[PDB]
């Protein structure tokens, strides 16, 4: 691995309480100093890298870390730094209290105890998440990037609860049976040109995009519960569709119909999604996102 700009001094780091196993490795919440311009205390995560990993793994963690780089979204989880020099290896990014969009859904699921409980997302409330969510995905196809793994648990939540495109491959292992070998496909979450050709395009992303609707429609139910992998490869390359999940505003359901056109031509741009929904955006929207952008054409 080679040492870059992005290198912060050990010293420059404190961590504290533990967040939620990643990929590599444990991730921690702490505090950097001088990642975020001048700032001496920033709240940041810190990926780690179990201690008894090869110097070959180490290498590898950093050169996936290093993809996120080039990104610097307000709707995509930043990355602030890396320490390379000497052990633990570690890797600073944008703290996002709040976890995974699926466990953010599904703690938002009723207890089964007697006790009181929040309602479901309000559609303003989802609206809200879908336009954040396809604000950071237009912004990656814009630097020419396919995510090919598009999905509520990719996908991380903040303290304000913003919603971000998160930190890239870190639950294969988190939520395994997401996930289907016969390499590792999200199948569930896959068009059907992917299934059958092993092709992957913004248009496939968009799919993605319309289950991750779904997700926050159903609380991050299993798509296509009721049938095994194989059955969903069959069912989604015959052209079969997820059901519009009971309670779910028409103008929701729409929109994930729009993303799961057979044809990928015919599905919306990101940009496009957006264009749809900016009405119902927060006023900030206009001035944090991508879409409002100089470098949005
Ligand atoms: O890191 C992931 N999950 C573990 C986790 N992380 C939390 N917060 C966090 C991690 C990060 C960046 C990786 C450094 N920023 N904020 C957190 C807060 C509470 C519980 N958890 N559990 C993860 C998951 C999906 C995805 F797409 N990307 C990353």
Same mark, same amino acid.
């Given at each position: 691995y080679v040492p870059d700009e992005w290198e912060v001094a050990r010293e420059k780091i404190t961590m504290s309480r533990e967040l939620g196993?990643?990929?590599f490795?444990? +991730? *921690?919440?702490?505090?950097?100093?001088?990642?975020?311009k001048d700032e001496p205390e920033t709240r940041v995560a810190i990926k780690t890298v179990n201690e008894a990993a090869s110097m070959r793994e180490r290498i590898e963690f950093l050169n996936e870390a290093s993809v996120m780089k080039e990104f610097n979204c307000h709707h995509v989880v930043r990355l602030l730094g890396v320490v390379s020099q000497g052990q633990p290896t570690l +890797?600073?990014?944008?703290?996002?209290?709040?976890?995974?969009?699926?466990s953010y859904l599904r703690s938002l699921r009723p207890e089964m105890e007697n006790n009181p409980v929040l309602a479901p997302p309000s559609l303003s409330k989802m609206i809200q998440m879908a336009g954040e969510i396809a604000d950071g995905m237009a912004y990656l /196809?814009? /630097?020419?990037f396919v995510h090919r793994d598009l999905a509520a648990r990719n996908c991380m939540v903040a303290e304000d609860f913003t919603v971000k495109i998160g930190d890239f491959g870190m639950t294969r292992d988190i939520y395994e049976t997401d996930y289907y070998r016969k390499g590792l496909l999200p199948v569930r979450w896959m068009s059907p040109e992917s299934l059958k050709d092993g092709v992957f395009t913004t248009y496939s992303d968009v799919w993605s995009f319309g289950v991750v609707l779904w997700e926050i429609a159903t609380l991050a139910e299993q798509p296509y519960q009721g049938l095994s992998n194989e059955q969903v490869l069959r069912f989604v390359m015959e052209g079969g569709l997820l059901d519009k999940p009971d309670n779910c505003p028409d103008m929701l359901f729409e929109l994930?119909?729009?993303?799961?056109? *057979? /044809?990928?031509?015919?599905?919306?741009?990101?940009?496009?999604?957006?264009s749809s929904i900016k009405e119902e955006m927060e006023?900030?929207?206009?001035?944090?996102?991508?879409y409002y952008s100089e470098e949005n054409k």
């Open positions: 196993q990643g990929s490795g444990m +991730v *921690y919440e702490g505090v950097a100093k001088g990642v975020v +890797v600073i990014m944008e703290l996002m209290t709040r976890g995974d969009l699926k /196809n814009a /630097n020419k994930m119909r729009m993303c799961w056109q *057979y /044809n990928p031509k015919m599905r919306p741009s990101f940009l496009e999604i957006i006023p900030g929207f206009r001035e944090v996102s991508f």
